[PDB]
Design a protein around this ligand. Structure first.
Ligand SMILES: CC(C)CCC[C@@H](C)[C@H]1CC[C@H]2[C@@H]3CC=C4C[C@@H](O)CC[C@]4(C)[C@H]3CC[C@]12C
Lengths: 168, 140, 250, 278, 115
């Protein structure tokens, strides 16, 4: 998968995983419907909990998405925010970045995620592996070899991060 | 190591002294009680008997049976005496056991440290002797 | 860098930053939670007494509900940051299990009784108190030391089995009721390994043939085995303790 | 004004010798006071000596009532001795002349033992040992709190296992104080056999398993964690002290060598100057 | 943007909808409160009063309260006073209605069942 995805010939496409949550909510409710707990001795009926689950699952299922795409085509592309049907966000550079973000718990354990920053863009969350730092800017250089724009790091500029397009 | 045991035995005997002479007149209602059925009355009776019984508590053998035999005293809400003897036995036993094992471990540590520095010195002396032997061979 | 205008994910990370800023870094909220938990601990210590519980049972039920709802609120707030990180944690699993068992026994009928309600509360007391620093190092090194304790325990038990064969050859139906039953025999051997008050056992097998008999042999074999095993166990315990504690000192 | 002379007097060894002599005679008074005859008869010597001792201790508190309590409020041994003086002075003020409502006598030998503790407050070698072992107070407090939490956990477990059912086992896992004392006994080695014979007759077969699990947790963990913690705390405390002492000795050695080198250079320069001028 | 298209599809803009859901929760809970009061005062038909659904609509109450709060927090950064006033008014009315129903249920306690 290491040499398949970072090349990313021309455009990239992206989706959301909320359909998984909607399908799981539907499965859980359909389990809850037939032969649930019989708590009439509790002087109550708990059908409204799966009813509210159905409201939530139906609303989450309504979040349809055709293949969130940009103009990351390996050219002088505008990085115009593209969706099958409607289009919203357009900007001449200086907005599409890739930024490393950090999160901490009460203990102090650090979790590292990555986000393609821009006007209502999609993130670049990696597949469930953030305990060590590894290589940092190697995938950043791969993104640069794609269509070099930015590779931002945490906190301010300082050092250890590279920029390619600036608006001054 | 017993040469190094210069102040720990003094503190041990002085803590023994103060706690024993304190605990003479604490369970003063035990030996000086007119209960016919009792078998540990002579433990707290005399000062030397008090020394013997607090050494027994220091060794921590049958402290449960001892306390159950002092439970035959009229229970005065156990507010000062039971907590005093329990704190004495636990604090003395754990503190002095830990301090003596720590001191003997430190004795072994410094014995091995002196050994380590001594073969270190022997090795650098041997290396210097080898270098001076090469110097003597070259000078000839 | 300059960050002329923030985006949606910067907003989300900022919101999570304020979410972890409170109740995770603020000493006031943790202090209030510790105060409430110490108060219900005091009420726990006020139990074992019906003379107090007759005017306190309704208040005990109310404070039970209060501590349960603040516990589940804390668990929900922890789940807000993500179910994956809360499920994949070394210690949050324990608090989740504690609140799950307590709430399952509370809302649904259960045979859990006080023997579940109170120990779970004091487990939560411990889990709150270790978060405040000056016992966290000691509990951390205790849980670091236990995997090295495991091998010593396993070796001790295996040696005690392979010597309990020699034991049970002279056990059962004679000097009985503590050397019989092959597991009560094992646990009586363990009692003697703990090395306190075996003179009852010494008088138990006393007077076999009143001078030597096997009164010499079995007693001396078992006694030298007991003293060797007790020394080995106590040593191996303290040395594993100091070995895993040297990892702390590094 | 006269504070310099007063501090010079308090630095003199004669006042400390008089103080040590008075409290050693107090120790001998306690030695003779644990007897019964000299406790109340042939006791005029006891009366006059005790008056002398309380006069001396009042004088010591008068020396320690100065502005130096700006240092007797943050320090180590110093707060200990002034608090010892306070908890000495108040009770025998309400005991020797009591005239009050009180239960009975349990703090005569205790007060005299506090005076013996004030005797042992000297001996600077013991002070250095106390300094070397005083950083373990936080550690032993933390392990004591861990012991108390585990004791509370198994206290409520034992009450709910053997005291709630109310079919026996009373005053062992029954009343809370007796339950706590039995748990402290069971976490040690003492009294486990008789308690085991007591508990197995209450129709609870798993009680033996629970008790042996409790022993193999509590006794081993408490004893061995305590001995390891204190062993390496003492080792790391003495390692830095010995290293600092050797560093000071080395610094003195190099200073002496530098003094010798400077003296040799001065002698060589003087000899050269006398040879030139001669 | 094309609110048009905003309201178009695939999903929708930020939060909002999640705030107006608390509104329709307020509508249905106000209707249930009105039915409860109406059956308590005049008709006296405790057979069909909402004695039966007791804890599940309280859970609906609390999730609606949390939802209105989270919507207010997630909609405050737009920098516009009208949205903040909208969300805060909805939060205030939901809290008032929750406290009102809590008082009502605590009052009518001798009328459900006994434990
Ligand atoms: C599921 C989520 C959206 C919460 C909505 C809860 C709805 C479905 C619940 C809560 C209030 C409920 C009603 C409350 C009162 C009445 C009258 C009573 O005599 C029978 C039940 C009946 C007719 C209930 C039907 C279901 C109901 C409308």
């Amino acid at each position: 998968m290491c040499w398949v995805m970072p090349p990313s010939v021309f455009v990239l496409e992206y989706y959301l995983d909320t359909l998984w949550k909607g399908t799981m909510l539907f499965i859980i409710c359909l389990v809850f419907i037939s032969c649930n707990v019989l708590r009439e001795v509790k002087y109550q009926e708990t059908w409204c909990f799966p009813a509210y689950g159905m409201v939530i699952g139906l609303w989450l299922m309504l979040s349809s998405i055709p293949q969130r795409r940009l103009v990351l085509n390996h050219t002088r592309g505008m990085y115009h925010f593209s969706i099958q049907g409607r289009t919203v966000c357009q900007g001449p550079m200086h907005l599409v970045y890739v930024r490393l973000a950090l999160s901490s718990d009460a203990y102090g354990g650090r979790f590292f995620q990555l986000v393609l920053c821009g006007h209502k863009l999609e993130p670049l969350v990696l597949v469930q592996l953030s305990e060590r730092y590894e290589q940092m800017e190697f995938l950043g250089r791969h993104l640069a070899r794609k269509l070099n724009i930015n590779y931002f790091d945490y906190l301010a500029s300082s050092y250890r991060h590279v920029v390619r397009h600036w608006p001054l | 190591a017993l040469k190094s045991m210069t102040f720990l035995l003094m503190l041990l005997l002085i803590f023994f002294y103060i706690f024993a002479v304190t605990g003479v007149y604490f369970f003063r209602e035990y030996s000086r009680s007119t209960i016919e059925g009792l078998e540990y009355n002579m433990f707290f009776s005399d000062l030397l008997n008090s020394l013997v019984t607090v050494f027994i508590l220091f060794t921590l053998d049958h402290w449960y049976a001892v306390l159950q035999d002092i439970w035959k005293v009229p229970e005065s809400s156990r507010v000062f005496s039971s907590i005093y003897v329990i704190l004495w036995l636990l604090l003395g036993s754990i503190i002095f056991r830990n301090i003596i094992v720590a001191m003997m471990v430190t004795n072994f540590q410094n014995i091995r440290s002196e050994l380590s520095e001594e073969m270190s010195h022997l090795e650098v002396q041997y290396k210097a002797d080898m270098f001076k032997q090469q110097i003597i061979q070259r000078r000839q | 860098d300059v960050m002329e205008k923030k985006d949606a994910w910067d907003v989300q990370e900022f919101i999570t930053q304020m979410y972890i800023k409170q109740l995770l870094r603020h000493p006031a909220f943790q202090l209030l939670l510790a105060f409430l938990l110490l108060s219900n601990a005091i009420t726990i210590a006020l139990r074992t007494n019906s003379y107090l519980g007759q005017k306190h049972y309704e208040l005990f039920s109310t404070i039970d509900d209060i501590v349960l709802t603040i516990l589940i609120c804390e668990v929900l707030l922890g789940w807000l940051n993500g179910f994956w990180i809360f499920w994949k944690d070394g210690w949050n699993i324990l608090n989740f299990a504690i609140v799950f068992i307590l709430f399952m026994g509370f809302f649904i009928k259960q045979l859990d009784m006080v023997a579940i309600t109170y120990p779970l509360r004091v487990l939560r007391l411990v889990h709150v108190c270790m978060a405040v620093e000056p016992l966290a190092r000691i509990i951390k090194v205790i849980l670091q030391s236990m995997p090295d304790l495991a091998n010593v325990m396993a070796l001790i038990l295996f040696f005690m089995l392979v010597f309990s064969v020699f034991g049970v050859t002279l056990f059962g139906a004679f000097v009985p009721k503590h050397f019989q039953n092959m597991g009560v025999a094992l646990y009586t051997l363990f009692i003697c390994i703990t090395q306190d008050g075996w003179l009852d056992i010494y008088t138990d097998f006393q007077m076999d043939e009143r001078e030597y008999a096997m009164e010499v042999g079995g007693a001396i074999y078992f006694a030298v085995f007991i003293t060797l095993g007790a020394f080995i166990g106590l040593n191996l315990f303290v040395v594993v303790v100091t070995t895993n504690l040297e990892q702390m000192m590094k | 004004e006269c504070q310099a002379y007063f501090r010079k007097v308090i630095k003199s060894t004669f006042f400390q010798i008089v103080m040590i002599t008075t409290v050693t005679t107090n120790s001998f008074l306690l030695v003779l006071g644990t007897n019964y005859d000299i406790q109340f008869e042939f006791f005029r010597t006891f009366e006059v000596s005790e008056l002398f001792f309380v006069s001396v201790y009042v004088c010591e508190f008068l020396m320690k009532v100065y502005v130096d309590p700006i240092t007797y409020w943050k320090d180590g041994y110093n707060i200990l001795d002034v608090i010892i003086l306070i908890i000495l002075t108040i009770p025998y003020l309400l005991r020797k002349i009591k005239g009050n409502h009180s239960a009975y006598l349990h703090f005569a030998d205790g007060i005299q033992s506090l005076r013996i503790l004030k005797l042992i407050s000297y001996s600077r070698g013991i002070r250095t040992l106390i300094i070397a072992v005083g950083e373990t107070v936080y550690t032993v407090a933390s392990v004591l709190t861990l012991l108390f939490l585990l004791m509370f956990v198994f206290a409520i477990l034992g009450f709910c296992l053997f005291g709630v059912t109310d079919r026996g086992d009373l005053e062992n896992w029954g009343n809370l104080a007796s339950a706590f004392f039995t748990l402290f006994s069971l976490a040690t080695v003492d009294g486990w056999t008789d308690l085991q014979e007591e508990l197995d007759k209450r129709k609870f077969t798993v009680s033996r398993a629970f008790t042996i699990l409790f022993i193999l947790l509590a006794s081993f963990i408490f004893l061995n964690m305590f001995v390891g913690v204190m062993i390496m705390h003492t080792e790391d405390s003495m390692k830095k002290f010995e290293r600092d002492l050797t560093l000071e000795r080395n610094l003195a050695i190099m200073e002496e060598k530098q003094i010798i080198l400077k003296r040799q250079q001065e002698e060589v320069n003087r000899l050269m100057n006398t040879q030139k001028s001669g | 943007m094309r609110w048009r298209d905003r309201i178009a599809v695939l999903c929708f803009p930020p939060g909002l909808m999640l705030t107006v859901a608390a509104l329709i929760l307020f509508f249905i809970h106000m209707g249930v409160f009105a039915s409860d009061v109406h059956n308590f005062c005049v008709i006296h038909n405790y057979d069909h009063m909402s004695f039966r659904y007791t804890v599940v609509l309280i859970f609906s109450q609390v999730i609606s309260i949390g939802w209105a709060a989270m919507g207010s927090l997630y909609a405050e950064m737009t920098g516009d006073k009208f949205l903040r006033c909208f969300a805060l008014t909805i939060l205030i009315l939901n809290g008032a209605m929750f406290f009102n129903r809590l008082c009502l249920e605590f009052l009518a306690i001798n009328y459900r069942e006994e434990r």
